Design a protein around this ligand. Structure first.
Ligand SMILES: NC(=O)C1=CN([C@@H]2O[C@H](COP(=O)(O)OP(=O)(O)OC[C@H]3O[C@@H](n4cnc5c(N)ncnc54)[C@H](OP(=O)(O)O)[C@@H]3O)[C@@H](O)[C@H]2O)C=CC1
Length: 325
């Protein structure tokens, strides 16, 4: 039940997802071209069979290059690889959903994506511009209609362009809007949100479990802590005293402890690293386990403080972080 060779958990639609994957976000201005492609190939050699990306990260093509090359080499087959892509805020308009996915398919040079999700529940003004703002720097929004957007997504699955459908950054109310939708064809199988020892998501996780929705934890190591956008007010997760002390009990790092914590609770983790050594390190989480006591010690570290607040959009009608969960 969870080994390096076998670690996929069931999704409610019949498919499965590798409990750990490689995250690929990285600040453009300072990330050398090819770093992503090289990192993805290293991840595959190491044992990863899940990659998390997004067209807006500006390196989706590099993910395709690495996946296609590893298939060409015969290291893996397409069906062995699980790739997750995301529909951005500026693409919520129903008629723009399929064209957006197809563009990503051209970028990857693949026939389908294993998981496609609505990146944020907030709709932004349609266009090529990813971060639309008017002359006065004010954010250009659009009226959201999550049920209409979801229907367009379902049609994408019916056409064979994506295996499983999901969401990201959705709160309880937003999930329920979809779940109780009349004529619902494909239930969301996953909700990707921030999750780690400082923000354990106890109520949302419990809610998702009740509806057989699997949570994928983004920023599982606590983010890169880039001041430009990260809530630096909260202390660096990997420097946590207890996590480090627990690490010495099994000769593992804090990073390895936090990753084991979530996977052991049935939570998918997608740590990002473009460093040869760290990529390998993050994968060594199947040769040990945390005791029931230790899981409770780690859970008690919950501060209910997000490292990713997205405050610039707190004025959007569908901003997901006002509600308790
Ligand atoms: N849908 C959404 O709204 C969002 C989705 N995401 C997704 O979730 C993924 C989660 O990763 P992310 O948010 O970037 O942050 P993470 O918490 O995964 O990692 C942040 C930093 O950790 C470092 N790191 C990795 N391994 C180790 C280690 N063993 N020891 C010390 N430092 C380490 C990396 O540096 P280095 O590369 O030098 O190793 C990196 O800069 C993303 O890459 C993205 O795919 C992220 C935010 C939002």
């Amino acid at each position: 039940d969870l080994s390096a060779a076998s670690h996929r958990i069931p999704l409610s639609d019949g498919n499965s997802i590798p409990i750990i994957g490689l995250g690929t976000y990285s600040e453009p201005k300072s990330t050398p071209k090819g770093a992503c492609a090289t990192s993805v190939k290293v991840a595959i050699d190491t044992g990863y069979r899940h990659i998390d990306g997004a067209y807006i990260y500006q390196n989706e093509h590099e993910v395709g290059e690495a996946i296609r090359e590893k298939i060409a080499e015969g290291k893996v087959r397409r069906e062995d690889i699980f790739y997750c892509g995301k529909l951005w805020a500026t693409n919520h308009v129903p008629e723009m959903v399929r064209p957006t996915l197809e563009r990503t398919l051209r970028v990857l040079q693949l026939d389908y994506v294993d998981l496609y999700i609505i990146e944020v529940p907030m709709a932004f003004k349609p266009g090529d511009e990813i971060y639309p703002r008017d002359e006065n720097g004010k954010w250009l929004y659009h009226k959201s209609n999550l049920c209409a957007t979801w229907e367009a997504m379902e049609a994408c699955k019916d056409a064979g362009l994506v295996k499983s459908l999901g969401v990201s950054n959705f709160n309880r109310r937003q999930l329920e809007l979809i779940l109780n939708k009349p004529g619902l064809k494909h239930k969301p199988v996953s909700n990707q949100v921030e999750c780690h020892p400082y923000f354990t998501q106890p109520k949302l996780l419990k809610f998702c479990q009740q509806h057989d929705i699997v949570i994928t934890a983004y920023s599982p190591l606590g983010t890169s802590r880039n001041p430009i956008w990260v809530n630096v007010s909260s202390p660096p997760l990997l420097k946590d005293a207890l996590l480090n002390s627990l690490g010495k009990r099994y000769n593992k790092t804090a990073a390895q402890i936090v990753l084991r914590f979530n996977i052991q609770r049935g939570v998918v983790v997608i740590p990002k690293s473009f460093n040869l050594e760290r990529i390998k390190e993050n994968f060594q989480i199947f040769d040990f386990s945390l005791t029931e006591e230790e899981m409770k010690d780690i859970e008690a570290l919950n501060k209910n403080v997000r490292f990713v607040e997205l405050l610039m959009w707190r004025d959007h009608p569908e901003y997901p972080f006002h509600d308790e969960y």
